[PDB]
């Protein structure tokens, strides 16, 4: 009955752990021991964007590295020009509780979702010049935590009902569902090739999904509490996770285990967002103590602090040319650092 | 093209300044516990009530997006200890630590609460009612620091007078917040 199956599961877990231990030839610290340190990383706020009434929950850069979308829980989706601080669009939402937003890689569409369990797709390049709701995707049984456009016709969403999904915007139907998590899925991150992606959930685990076949290939368990953010390394062979135990961790897909832990004795708040700089040498992480930190991903030593916000930092992003960082916060201001 | 961008920014800003007026003059309420949006207006002031019935049973992630709401309406009828524990976890949350609670005791006994044998307020039903109210108030008045309070009520009828009560406690909440900001309370 259940006893034999659970014994088999424990045996398989032990075998997996032993196989992983057989590969621990050395540590990342011993290999990057003789590497020149980054030094001190100092950044200055170039622009401050002020148009939101309530706290900001998400932001996302465009592929041209100039325009960016942001979502606020007053019911607003604002598109900004970051160079000139202008406003391009301001879109009102039917539901004021929006937890995520995304930008199409072509720049023609925008998506959002939240406590309404629905993903809304808006057409920016309207024939009439007016941003109108192109599509509403409704098949989740819990609030949406993340969404990421694969192209103009496909989108991956993650929900609080412990599932991920791939959609078809032309027909508005789910194509495949990714179901292995036992807690809310909090974040997802697409690969550079958009053939796989990773998800982090509230069971303190992360899972690698194959988009085309709709299965789970690897599971990574190093954290001790809920995982809030996840990001992919520039070459797509590693990823970084930040959680509620006040640590970040770096995992390797090919070695199938955790490599580095970025933690400090004076940090006792959770990480709300993570991102990687252009070369993968810096790891940007936002926290609940209102400021972000910069970590030397190869040496796990703090190299700088981004202290400019008066409330909890919710979002964090780096441009595709690597020339600016945008951070939003619960005090309703976005800031751009260089 | 800079002129056109400046003009578009002007239109956006003009609409935003008009939307901010409507946003700030409205009071948003959460209705967890028991019984989606509902817009109702009492004495020329608009209220906006939300009910979150379509989600799962894990509350610790979507509850912290209600940290700017004016008040939380908690309807509570061992089903009592679960409501007490939910209230105790809401009260001590890091993000809901300045939110007031309007408590509706919808019901209107020593085996599950042994402290009842030595509690002094038919008078028996009033003793029971005030025992339950005192349990909730003993949780609330222990870790407040003065930034939020609890307003308990007894509700059993067709609820002809349940809308004026929320009005009255939402007025008291703001009056106390302003009096405390002016160093007067």
């Amino acid at each position, epitope marked *: 009955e259940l006893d034999q199956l659970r014994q088999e599961a424990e045996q398989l877990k032990n075998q997996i752990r032993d196989a992983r231990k057989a590969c621990a030839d050395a540590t990342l610290s011993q290999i990057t021991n003789n590497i020149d340190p980054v030094g001190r990383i100092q950044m200055r706020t170039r622009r401050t964007l002020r148009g939101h009434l309530a706290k900001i929950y998400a932001m996302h850069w465009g592929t041209d590295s100039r325009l960016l979308v942001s979502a606020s829980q007053d019911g607003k989706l604002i598109i900004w020009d970051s160079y000139t601080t202008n406003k391009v669009h301001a879109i009102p939402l039917r539901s004021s509780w929006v937890m995520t937003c995304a930008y199409a890689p072509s720049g023609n569409y925008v998506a959002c979702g939240g406590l309404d369990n629905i993903c809304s797709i808006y057409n920016l390049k309207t024939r009439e010049g007016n941003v109108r709701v192109s599509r509403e995707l409704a098949g989740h049984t819990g609030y949406l935590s993340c969404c990421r456009f694969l192209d103009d016709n496909q989108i991956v969403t993650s929900s609080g009902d412990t599932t991920c999904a791939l959609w078809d915007i032309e027909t508005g139907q789910q194509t495949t569902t990714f179901t292995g998590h036992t807690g809310d899925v909090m974040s997802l991150s697409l690969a550079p090739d958009t053939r796989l992606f990773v998800s982090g959930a509230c069971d303190a685990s992360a899972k690698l999904w194959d988009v085309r076949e709709g299965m789970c290939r690897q599971t990574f368990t190093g954290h*001790e509490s*809920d995982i809030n953010a996840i990001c992919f390394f520039p070459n797509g062979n590693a990823f970084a996770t930040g959680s509620d135990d*006040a640590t970040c961790r770096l995992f390797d897909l090919r070695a199938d285990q955790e490599l580095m832990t970025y933690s400090h004795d004076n940090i006792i708040c959770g990480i709300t967002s993570v991102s990687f700089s252009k070369s993968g040498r810096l790891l940007l992480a936002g926290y609940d103590d209102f400021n972000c930190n910069v970590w030397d991903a190869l040496k796990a030593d703090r190299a700088g602090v981004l202290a400019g916000h008066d409330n909890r930092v919710s979002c964090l992003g780096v441009t595709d040319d690597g020339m600016a960082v945008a951070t939003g916060s619960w005090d309703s201001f976005l800031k751009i650092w260089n | 093209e800079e002129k056109a961008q400046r003009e578009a920014n002007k239109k956006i800003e003009k609409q935003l300044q008009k939307d901010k007026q409507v946003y700030r003059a409205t009071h948003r309420l959460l209705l967890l516990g028991a019984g989606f949006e509902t817009k109702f207006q009492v004495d020329k002031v608009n209220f906006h009530m939300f009910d979150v019935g379509g989600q799962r049973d894990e509350r*610790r992630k979507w509850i912290q997006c209600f940290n700017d709401v004016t008040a939380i309406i908690f309807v509570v009828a061992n089903r009592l*200890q679960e409501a007490l524990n939910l209230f105790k*976890s809401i009260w001590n*949350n890091r993000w809901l630590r300045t939110i007031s609670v309007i408590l509706f005791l919808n019901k209107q006994i020593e085996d599950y609460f042994p402290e009842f044998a030595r509690y002094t307020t038919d008078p028996r039903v009033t003793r029971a009612k005030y025992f339950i109210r005192d349990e909730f108030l003993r949780i609330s008045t222990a870790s407040g620091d003065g930034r939020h309070y609890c307003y308990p009520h007894f509700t059993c009828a067709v609820d002809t007078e349940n809308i004026r009560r929320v009005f009255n406690d939402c007025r008291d909440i703001i009056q106390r917040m302003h009096l405390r900001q002016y160093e007067l309370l």
Partner: nanobody
Amino acid sequence: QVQLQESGGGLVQPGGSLRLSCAASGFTFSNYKMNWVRQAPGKGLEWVSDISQSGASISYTGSVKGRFTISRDNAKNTLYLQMNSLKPEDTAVYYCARCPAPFTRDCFDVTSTTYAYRGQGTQVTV
């Protein structure tokens, strides 16, 4: 990986004494609050007891107040429940549950249908 494993229990006559134990691994035991939860045959999960990070604060449900005792050994990373003067009502599955996050004062979601940081439980028949 967060693992909690419970031991102790079985069949006892009314008035007997048992000592449930819960051994935890995969996390820092002393940063978290710990709880005892039970599921009776026929009803839902019910909260029994809780103990804080150091053991100074202790709370019991009404029906067990006076005849159950919770304690934690942080050096050995283990949690206990001493149950004496048992009743036929006390028969249930007993789980050892953990707070979602460290250093916090609130314990959300511990008695949910599908919770991630609680053990598999042990049966107690009286």
